[PDB]
Amino acid sequence: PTINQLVRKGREKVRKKSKVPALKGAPFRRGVCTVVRTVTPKKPNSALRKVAKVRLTSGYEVTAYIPGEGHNLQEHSVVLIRGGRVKDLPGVRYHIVRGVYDAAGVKDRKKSRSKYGTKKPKEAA
Amino acid sequence: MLTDPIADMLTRIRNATRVYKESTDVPASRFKEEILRILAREGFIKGYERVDVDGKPYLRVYLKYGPRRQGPDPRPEQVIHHIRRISKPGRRVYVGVKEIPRVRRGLGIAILSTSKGVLTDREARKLGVGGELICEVW
Amino acid sequence: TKADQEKLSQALARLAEEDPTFRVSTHPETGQTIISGMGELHLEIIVDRLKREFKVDANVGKPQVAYRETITKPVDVEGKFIRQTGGRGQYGHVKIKVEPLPRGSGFEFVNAIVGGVIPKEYIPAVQKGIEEAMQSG
RNA sequence: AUGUGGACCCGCCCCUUGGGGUGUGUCCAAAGGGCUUUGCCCGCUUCCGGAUGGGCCCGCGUCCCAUCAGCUAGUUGGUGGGGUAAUGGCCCACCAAGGCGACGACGGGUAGCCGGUCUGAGAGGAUGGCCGGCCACAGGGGCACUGAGACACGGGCCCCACUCCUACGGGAGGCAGCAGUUAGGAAUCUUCCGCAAUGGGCGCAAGCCUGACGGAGCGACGCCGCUUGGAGGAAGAAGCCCUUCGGGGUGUAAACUCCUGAACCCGGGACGAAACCCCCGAGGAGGGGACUGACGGUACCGGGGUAAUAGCGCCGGCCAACUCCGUGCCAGCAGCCGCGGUAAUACGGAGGGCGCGAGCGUUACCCGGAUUCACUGGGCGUAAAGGGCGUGUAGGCGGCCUGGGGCGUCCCAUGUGAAAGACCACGGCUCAACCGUGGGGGAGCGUGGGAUACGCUCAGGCUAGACGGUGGGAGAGGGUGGUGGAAUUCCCGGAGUAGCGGUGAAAUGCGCAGAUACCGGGAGGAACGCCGAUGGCGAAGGCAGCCACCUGGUCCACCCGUGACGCUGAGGCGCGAAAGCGUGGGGAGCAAACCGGAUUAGAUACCCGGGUAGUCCACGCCCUAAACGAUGCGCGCUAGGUCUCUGGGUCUCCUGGGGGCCGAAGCUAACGCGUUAAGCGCGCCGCCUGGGGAGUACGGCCGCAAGGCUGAAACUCAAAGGAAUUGACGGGGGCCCGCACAAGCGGUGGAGCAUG
RNA sequence: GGGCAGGCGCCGAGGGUAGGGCCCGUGACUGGGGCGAAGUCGUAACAAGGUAGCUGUACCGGAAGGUGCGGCUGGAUCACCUC
RNA sequence: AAGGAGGUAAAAAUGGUAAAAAA
RNA sequence: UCCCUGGGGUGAUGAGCUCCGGGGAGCCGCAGUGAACAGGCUCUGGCGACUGUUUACCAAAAACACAGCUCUCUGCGAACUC
RNA sequence: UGAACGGCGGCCGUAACUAUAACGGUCCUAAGGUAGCGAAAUUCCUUGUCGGGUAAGUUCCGACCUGCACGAAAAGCGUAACG
């Protein structure tokens, strides 16, 4: 590229793509949803994972997951489009929250209460 | 041919340095004379003189070597460790006062041609005059 | 079309959030969200408000039904899979007797080997294909 | 009217874009109000000078797409005009043809710019909210007006939409002003106080308007500081987790003790505010007295005094921390790699501990690590990549020597770079955060002088690079005509008769209608045996009998000449295997497609019989590749030993140019390169930035077609891949060996019978 | 003297007619591609993969594959002409 | 005759068989 | 309508006469090629290549024709044909 | 010998809903219709099924493909210009 050619041309900036088009700057969204199902991760699992299709307040039928055991969710919930794929469900992108307008965590949870709902386990004793 | 008989010289230098051959030749010019002047002038080469080959004026340069140690082969160490042509005919460097490298931060040498003649790092900074940054050597 | 549908989930989003009362619950064994509630004319002028300031095209359907099923007789059959593909086969000759009992009982099956035929690795997975092929009547 | 002055007009002196003066001739002013009045305050009139802001202009810098290549007819320039504060086509006329473009025009996607700001050693990347400056809009568009100033947020007209008020004749309105309603969204507040302080508008002041401003409220949204306590307190009680029944841990932690004393009660109590003002002096300087708090009686000062909130992520490695049941590839965590498929330290629960603590995690966004678009700081033999190769345009850069130049470059002076922030220093609120003051460093362009080392510009000169002159030389180097033999099918003929053919085996196949084989002559086309090579020539793809013709390329010798004429070379140019194509001629052998045959389970294939396209001749058209040395080109440097082909020399040798191998140094991750470098350096072009999608689609250009040159994306995976080492494995090979073949001896299979 | 109104005329917002240009969404149908553990068929590549492979290309076949022309090693050893 | 290398001829009747996995 | 103005031509390089024109402003009406001659146009299938040739007396066409393609026959006493 | 007259199959089964059938078997023949086009000047059931075009579309275009009975020189397909 011998200085000259480098100057004449340019070494272009990498750019991104956002492997996470939650879009608008909105990775928090009103997950309306439709369906539930199950699906499997590669050759060593099988579970649940929803599909929450969401519609946001901008579009997309995504694959909104869930923060795990203890479900209700039926068909609205405002599944809070969040973010993070794995080797499971060809998507796992834009997760759910529990708390939102619905779910509010595992019936009795003692740790991840930062999304898994349950307030402050006051056993009142 | 040649685009830099200077950098080509520096290269033939690097040859004799890396091959351990007491002396090596390089054609007639005033500037090479200035440089090799600086070179002996800081205890590096072994000297220079306006010689000739076939009828063409040249400038031969003898050079310096260290002591012959044992164990890991006999190979004695080099004196003229390495020189790098900085201001290429594409990167016309033009150092000034507050500019200027420090070369091995303390030792080494910068070779640089200024308003008046061919100077060195410590010199040119002492002088307070600058110009093109030729090679580096330590 | 189900495009008008989620659109009307927004309709409900301001319908179920201005008037408590009714319950907008989908059915499981059939699709289509169901409008449940406590009033005839109530649900109806709900639908009017819809075809007024929400303009939905929804041919107000009759509620569907979840239909299970069964039989009433003992049939002996031959589930013989005599198929030797390119060497590995996966052939399975299953001889089953099948018995039916009361509507409300439950699902049965027996660990029934006539002597020691079918491997103990089919036991919890041959009956699967009994269960599996029993979701689709 | 009055006319110091100013305006224009024709001359004129200086000046040099429209800077100042001047001779002639005409036009222009004025506002007066108050009162302590014969004086002053406010204001007016004509101009000159500053102070201030802005207009116009240029210099320079200023996002992405080349799948944005042409753009323009008010368009480029003028004369004369219009208008503006004014140059100018911004608008009129008339007129000459120009004006911008790979230094990326035009078109489009996108963006308000900056002083600054977060990150990184740094280069840079990203960014421009509050704050300060510049711009732009007023719901959308035109529009003028007023005027010192505007195309004017709370002024005017019209049109648009939009929404309202009405007696449905008519009319009204613009929170991108300050709070506040609502849609929007995951999310961004009070429909609060005083003009007490500063500042802006007006007024002689008194003063008045100020949702500027100065304060209160709300939200852990950010940074900052702070309490939940101290101090004694057990081989350590109990409660619980664990255990091998000995205990271990939790933890001085708790309880008990004394102490101090958040929150809270009473009292006093702000700085924030001395000016404006009247008065003595003159209305000046000075001097006096007096007014002025929204917060809030909050800060804070004194005294009385109560121990008085604790969470959030984690404990598989990165990344600091484990034990116990359950769960059983189910429920499930998961940034990455994965963890669980009935003894999970990764899930879920429980003791403990790591961290952090009024915060902790989660996502999103950006910079880094990422040297992972590399300027510092990368690569193209095989992982990503040389363009199939020669031509050269521009451009890029350039050998020795002298002197001018002083453009690039260096140095000191210097204008500006506001403030604020960045740094050090001192300071203020009782620390901090936060703020007060001083000072230096600061890119950058304007202006001055000086330096001429390096690039370049200028004149002159040199021969080392480059071309030429002259003489010899090698070749399968290219276009043409021409000829020789060998050899295959074929015509005529002869002579001979039971098969040939082909193959792993055989068959289809030809044959008593006379074949295969041998001889005599004729037809035709295609490729040249040996020579001949590990060789020669060539830019590459290529060239093979020999003669002649034209003709390039190159080699050495002589130093005769020229004087840097140089290296690369984005587009453009030409060239080009074989297959393919078009228009005609020709076809012996050959041969895809196509048929028979045999083979197998199948044979649309390898093996056999026929047979076509096509392989040949000329013109043209397509232009591809493992076009492979997978290594660009030009030069210079850095060990030699050798086989060989050509150029020069008296020559068992040297030396120019090349063509195989080896191996110093060096280089590379390795194989391997190593004077034909993949080693050590300079110039220049193009090509690469995870595999796949993919050489696909799109646009654009060429083709007669089959296609080609340019060439992404979403999405999908956490790998694809290079090298070498092992080990296996093989229907690659070598070697050795045994009742394996051999060599010999007696048997099995046959019979009846025993038994498995 | 003129002035205001008025009158005609220039430009002009908006709207209307026609035809372009770019981009996006979309669309019966459709090529292709990616993903899912052992599906059904053959077995081409890697040992000469059992016909050495690789490929430019042209004709063919259920498909992978085949084959003619030419090229290329990233192909081949009793032992044949040398280094 | 040592090796290594440089170009010419040799040599496979046929083969379908999978797979989550255990360290 | 009126003001101005360009070149070919003939005659002379001009008068006249003529051809072909450019511009400026002005006048009246419903309208100015004022009447007579005089085309509607675009999108997309079907088939045929295309201009044409055919049924005088119901046809004009997708039938025939055609340039062009292959297949055949003809060694001059051609073969074909009467 | 087929740019000569001409002809250019039938029956069974097979993938993990199902549906379908690259695939194999089988009786027949001289051999079993290649590419391309296809509810067509050919398609009977049929006003076939989907999609556009419309207030409504047996007509029309596009597309699907079980072509009753397309198809290679009575040529198959495609084609700007004319009619």
Swiss-Prot record, chain A:
Family: Belongs to the universal ribosomal protein uS12 family.
Disordered: annotated segments: 105-125
Gene symbol of the encoding locus: rpsL
InterPro entries xref list: NA-bd_OB-fold, Ribosomal_uS12, Ribosomal_uS12_bac
HAMAP family reported for this sequence: Ribosomal_uS12_B (MF_00403_B)
Gene Ontology CC terms: small ribosomal subunit
Chain positions with 3-methylthioaspartic acid modification: 88
Pfam families, A to Z: Ribosom_S12_S23
GO MF entry, a single one: tRNA binding
Biological process annotations from GO: translation
Bias (Basic residues) ranges: 108-119
Self-association and partners: Part of the 30S ribosomal subunit. Contacts proteins S8 and S17. May interact with IF1 in the 30S initiation complex.
SUPFAM superfamilies reported in the protein's UniProt record: Nucleic acid-binding proteins
Protein name, as recorded: Small ribosomal subunit protein uS12
Function noted in UniProt: With S4 and S5 plays an important role in translational accuracy. Interacts with and stabilizes bases of the 16S rRNA that are involved in tRNA selection in the A site and with the mRNA backbone. Located at the interface of the 30S and 50S subunits, it traverses the body of the 30S subunit contacting proteins on the other side and probably holding the rRNA structure together. The combined cluster of proteins S8, S12 and S17 appears to hold together the shoulder and platform of the 30S subunit.
Keywords for this protein: Methylation, Ribonucleoprotein, Ribosomal protein, RNA-binding, rRNA-binding, tRNA-binding
PROSITE patterns (UniProt xref): RIBOSOMAL_S12
CDD domains: Ribosomal_S12 (cd03368)
Curated annotation (Swiss-Prot), chain B:
Gene Ontology molecular function, alphabetical: rRNA binding; structural constituent of ribosome
Keyword set, alphabetical order: Ribonucleoprotein, Ribosomal protein, RNA-binding, rRNA-binding
NCBIfam families, A to Z: PRK00136.1 (NF001109)
UniProt protein name: Small ribosomal subunit protein uS8
Record's GO cellular component terms: ribonucleoprotein complex; ribosome
Cited function: One of the primary rRNA binding proteins, it binds directly to 16S rRNA central domain where it helps coordinate assembly of the platform of the 30S subunit.
InterPro entries xref list: Ribosomal_uS8, Ribosomal_uS8_CS, Ribosomal_uS8_sf
Family, similarity comment: Belongs to the universal ribosomal protein uS8 family.
SUPFAM superfamilies named in the record: Ribosomal protein S8 (SSF56047)
Organism for this UniProt entry: Thermus thermophilus (strain ATCC BAA-163 / DSM 7039 / HB27)
Pfam families: Ribosomal_S8
Signal sequence bounds: none
Gene Ontology BP, a term: translation
Subunit composition and interactions: Part of the 30S ribosomal subunit. Contacts proteins S5 and S12.
Curated annotation (Swiss-Prot), chain C:
Annotated compartments: Cytoplasm
Top-rank lineage group of the source organism: Bacteria
Physiological role: Catalyzes the GTP-dependent ribosomal translocation step during translation elongation. During this step, the ribosome changes from the pre-translocational (PRE) to the post-translocational (POST) state as the newly formed A-site-bound peptidyl-tRNA and P-site-bound deacylated tRNA move to the P and E sites, respectively. Catalyzes the coordinated movement of the two tRNA molecules, the mRNA and conformational changes in the ribosome.
Family: Belongs to the TRAFAC class translation factor GTPase superfamily. Classic translation factor GTPase family. EF-G/EF-2 subfamily.
Protein's name according to its UniProt entry: Elongation factor G
Species this chain originates from: Thermus thermophilus (strain ATCC BAA-163 / DSM 7039 / HB27)
